[PDB]
Amino acid sequence: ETPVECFEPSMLKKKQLTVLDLHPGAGKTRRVLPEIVREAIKTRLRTVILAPTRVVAAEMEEALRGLPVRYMTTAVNVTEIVDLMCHATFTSRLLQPIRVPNYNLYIMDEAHFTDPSSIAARGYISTRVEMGEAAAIFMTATPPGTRDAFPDSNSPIMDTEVEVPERAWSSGFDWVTDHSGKTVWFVPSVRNGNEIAACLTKAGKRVIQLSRKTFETEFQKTKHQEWDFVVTTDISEMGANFKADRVIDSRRCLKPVILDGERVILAGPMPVTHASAAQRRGRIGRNPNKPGDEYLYGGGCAETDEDHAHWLEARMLLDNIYLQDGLIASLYRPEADKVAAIEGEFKLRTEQRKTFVELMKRGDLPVWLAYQVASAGITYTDRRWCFDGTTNNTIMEDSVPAEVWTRHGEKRVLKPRWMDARVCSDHAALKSFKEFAAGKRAA
Ligand SMILES: Nc1nc2c(ncn2[C@@H]2O[C@H](COP(=O)(O)OP(=O)(O)OP(O)(O)=S)[C@@H](O)[C@H]2O)c(=O)[nH]1
Numbered sequence: 240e241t242p243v244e245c246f247e248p249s250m251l252k253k254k255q256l257t258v259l260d261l262h263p264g265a266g267k268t269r270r271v272l273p274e275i276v277r278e279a280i281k282t283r284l285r286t287v288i289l290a291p292t293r294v295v296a297a298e299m300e301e302a303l304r305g306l307p308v309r310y311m312t313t314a315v316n317v318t319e320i321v322d323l324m325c326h327a328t329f330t331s332r333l334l335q336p337i338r339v340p341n342y343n344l345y346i347m348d349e350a351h352f353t354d355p356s357s358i359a360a361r362g363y364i365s366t367r368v369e370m371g372e373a374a375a376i377f378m379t380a381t382p383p384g385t386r387d388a389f390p391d392s393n394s395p396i397m398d399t400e401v402e403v404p405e406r407a408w409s410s411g412f413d414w415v416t417d418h419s420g421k422t423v424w425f426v427p428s429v430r431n432g433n434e435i436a437a438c439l440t441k442a443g444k445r446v447i448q449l450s451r452k453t454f455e456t457e458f459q460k461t462k463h464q465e466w467d468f469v470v471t472t473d474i475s476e477m478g479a480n481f482k483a484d485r486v487i488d489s490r491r492c493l494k495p496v497i498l499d500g501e502r503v504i505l506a507g508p509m510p511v512t513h514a515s516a517a518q519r520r521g522r523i524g525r526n527p528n529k530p531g532d533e534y535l536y537g538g539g540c541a542e543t544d545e546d547h548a549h550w551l552e553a554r555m556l557l558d559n560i561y562l563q564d565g566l567i568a569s570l571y572r573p574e575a576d577k578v579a580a581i582e583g584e585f586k587l588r589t590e591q592r593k594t595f596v597e598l599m600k601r602g603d604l605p606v607w608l609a610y611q612v613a614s615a616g617i618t619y620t621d622r623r624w625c626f627d628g629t630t631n632n633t634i635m636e637d638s639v640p641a642e643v644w645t646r647h648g649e650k651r652v653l654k655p656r657w658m659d660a661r662v663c664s665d666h667a668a669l670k671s672f673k674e675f676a677a678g679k680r681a682a
C-alpha cells in the first residue's frame with residue numbers, strides 16, 4: 240500500500256506488490272534496476288521489465304548490458320530469463336491467443352502512466368500477484384492519489400504561476416522568447432502543440448514537437464544542443480529526459496469522456512492531475528549542481544473522477560484477455576474506483592472478440608470505438624459504419640465535411656455511426672481514420 244523509498248530483496252517474494260518511489264539522485268535506471276535484475280537472476284525468477292516508451296526501454300537495455308535480458312520491441316509471439324518490453328507491447332501480448340509466460344516478477348517503470356494499455360497491464364499484474372503467482376514492483380515518483388504537485392528535486396526549482404499562452408500570440412508574452420536557454424512546454428493536445436510550435440518557429444525558435452505517434456523518432460532530435468523549445472503532450476510525463484532549464488506548463492489536458500454511453504468527446508482543456516503536474520515539473524531541477532531551473536505554470540490541479548474513458552477502456556481490454564479457469568483480471572485497487580463496470584461486463588463472444596482486437600491492432604482505432612463496432616456484430620473489413628451515421632457525426636476537414644473515396648469506388652462524407660473525437664483530433668489522426676474508412680488499409 241504505502242510507497243517505499245528504496246529496493247530491498249524481500250520485495251521479490253510472491254504476493255508482494257510494492258510501489259517504489261525513489262528519491263532524486265538514486266539512479267533508478269543505471270543503479271537500482273540492475274540491482275533488482277541481478278537479484279532476480281540470482282533467485283532464478285522469470286522476470287519481465289515494462290518500460291512506458293521504446294525510448295525508456297532503450298535506456299534500460301543500455302543500463303542492463305551484459306545481463307541476460309531480451310528486449311522485445313514488438314508484440315510478436317515469443318516462446319533469456321529476463322524479458323524487456325513496453326507497457327503497450329505487454330498488453331498487446333496478453334490479447335494474443337497465446338499464453339504469456341508465467342512470470343513470477345513484474346517490474347513496471349513509470350507506473351503512473353494512465354493510458355489504457357498501462358492501466359490494463361497494472362490490473363493483470365496486480366491480479367497475478369494477489370493470486371500468489373508473482374511479485375511486482377511499480378516504480379513511480381507520483382503514486383496514485385498523490386496530491387503534491389511540487390515534490391523534491393536534485394536542485395531547487397523556481398516555481399511561478401503565470402499566464403501561459405493557449406493559442407498563437409503576436410505580442411504580450413516576451414518572457415517566453417527572451418529566454419536564452421532550453422524550454423520544455425507541455426500542451427494539452429497535438430493541435431494546440433502545432434499552433435504553439437508554429438508561433439515559436441515564426442519567432443525564430445528551433446522547436447521539436449513530441450506526441451505519442453511521433454515520440455520515438457522525434458525524441459532522438461532532442462539529444463543535441465540543437466533546439467530551443469520542446470513542445471510536447473503529456474507523453475513526456477513518462478520518463479522523458481531533457482537537458483532543459485525551464486518548463487512552461489499549461490497545467491491543462493484533454494479528457495476523453497464517454498457521454499451517455501453513445502460517443503467520446505475530448506473534454507477540456509481542463510486542469511491536470513497533481514501527479515501530471517509533478518511529472519511535468521519533474522523534467523527539470525535534475526542537476527544537483529545546477530540551480531535556477533524554472534517551472535512556470537498556468538493554473539491549478541484537479542483530480543480525475545470516474546468519467547475519464549481510459550479506465551473503462553482498460554476494463555474492456557481485461558475482459559477480453561483470458562486467464563486460467565476463465566478468470567478476468569481486476570484493475571489495480573487504487574484505480575478500481577475510477578470505473579463502475581464489473582469484471583466481465585465487456586467480455587465478447589469469440590468471433591466479436593477477434594474483431595475487437597483486429598480494430599485495435601490492425602485498424603488503429605481507440606479501444607472504446609473498436610468495442611462499439613465489434614459488439615454490434617460488424618466484421619473488420621465492413622467499413623459501412625464509417626459513413627451511415629447521423630449528420631451530427633460528420634467529421635469536418637478545413638471547415639467542410641471530410642470526404643473519402645471507398646475501395647468500392649464511391650465518394651462518401653465521413654459520418655461514423657459512433658463518434659469518437661480521438662479519430663479526428665489532429666491531422667495525423669484524421670488521415671489515419673480516413674485511410675481506415677476508405678477500406679484501403681488493412682494495415
Ligand atoms: N548522460 C548521463 N546522465 C546521467 C547519468 N547519471 C544520471 N544522469 C541523469 O541525471 C538526471 C538525474 O539523475 P537521478 O536523480 O538519479 O534520476 P533517475 O531518473 O533516477 O536517473 P536514471 O534512472 O536516468 S539513471 C537523470 O536524468 C539521469 O538520467 C550519467 O551517467 N550519464
Ligand SMILES: [Cl-]
Nearest residue numbers: 450451472474
Ligand atoms: Cl499525444
